[PDB]
Design an enzyme around this catalytic site. Structure first.
Site, PDB file in Angstrom:
ATOM      1  CE  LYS A  59      56.608  67.476  49.558  1.00 62.40           C
ATOM      2  NZ  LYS A  59      55.697  66.839  50.656  1.00 62.40           N
ATOM      3  CG  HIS A  85      58.717  60.038  54.996  1.00 64.19           C
ATOM      4  ND1 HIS A  85      59.943  61.275  54.592  1.00 64.19           N
ATOM      5  CD2 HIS A  85      60.481  59.036  54.590  1.00 64.19           C
ATOM      6  CE1 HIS A  85      61.049  60.619  53.097  1.00 64.19           C
ATOM      7  NE2 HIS A  85      60.719  58.579  53.631  1.00 64.19           N
ATOM      8  CG  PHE A  86      54.806  58.929  49.261  1.00 65.53           C
ATOM      9  CD1 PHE A  86      53.912  58.393  49.065  1.00 65.53           C
ATOM     10  CD2 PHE A  86      56.278  59.512  48.706  1.00 65.53           C
ATOM     11  CE1 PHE A  86      54.042  57.714  48.479  1.00 65.53           C
ATOM     12  CE2 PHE A  86      55.460  58.088  47.233  1.00 65.53           C
ATOM     13  CZ  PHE A  86      54.253  57.450  46.877  1.00 65.53           C
ATOM     14  CG  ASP A  87      62.234  56.204  51.171  1.00 65.08           C
ATOM     15  OD1 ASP A  87      62.577  57.492  51.860  1.00 65.08           O
ATOM     16  OD2 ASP A  87      63.118  55.837  50.675  1.00 65.08           O
ATOM     17  CG  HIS A  90      51.936  61.233  51.407  1.00 61.97           C
ATOM     18  ND1 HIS A  90      52.147  62.268  50.077  1.00 61.97           N
ATOM     19  CD2 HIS A  90      52.979  62.306  52.068  1.00 61.97           C
ATOM     20  CE1 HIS A  90      53.708  63.199  50.526  1.00 61.97           C
ATOM     21  NE2 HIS A  90      54.226  62.394  51.754  1.00 61.97           N
TER      22      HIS A  90
END
Length: 124
Positions: free
Chosen positions: A41, A119-121, A12
């Protein structure tokens, strides 16, 4: 192994650019970061902010994660991001993406000690 935190930076973080350079950006970045290694992905977002800025997001606005957990935080200000979304002729191993730049608040899940993004939400 790769720690949660190192993995987040890998998938990210892109501070070297202030925005999504061109249409080429996603095809090159997804591949470079090994995000098109075992499958394409589907979607991925890159944040063009300093790492200190993204980490400070863990002390920002606490919000519910998409999975119901409570360890997600929303940035008070908008950040520069690039959304990489897979295309149609995108066929593994020839993954193809559409580069999309924008400025939005990011939502990340944090954890650990120190409490860092893992984690990227979402982005809103």
């Amino acid at each position: 192994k790769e720690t949660a935190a190192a993995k987040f930076e890998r998938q990210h973080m892109d501070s070297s650019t202030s925005a999504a350079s061109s249409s080429n950006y996603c095809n090159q970045m997804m591949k470079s970061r090994n995000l098109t290694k075992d499958r394409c992905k589907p979607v991925n977002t890159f944040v063009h902010e300093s790492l200190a800025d993204v980490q400070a997001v863990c002390s920002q606005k606490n919000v519910a994660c998409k999975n119901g957990q409570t360890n997600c935080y929303q940035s008070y200000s908008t950040m520069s991001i690039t959304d990489c979304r897979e295309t149609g002729s995108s066929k593994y191993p020839n993954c193809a993406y559409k580069t999309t730049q924008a400025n939005k608040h990011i939502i990340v899940a944090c954890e650990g000690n120190p409490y860092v993004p893992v984690h990227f939400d979402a982005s809103v």
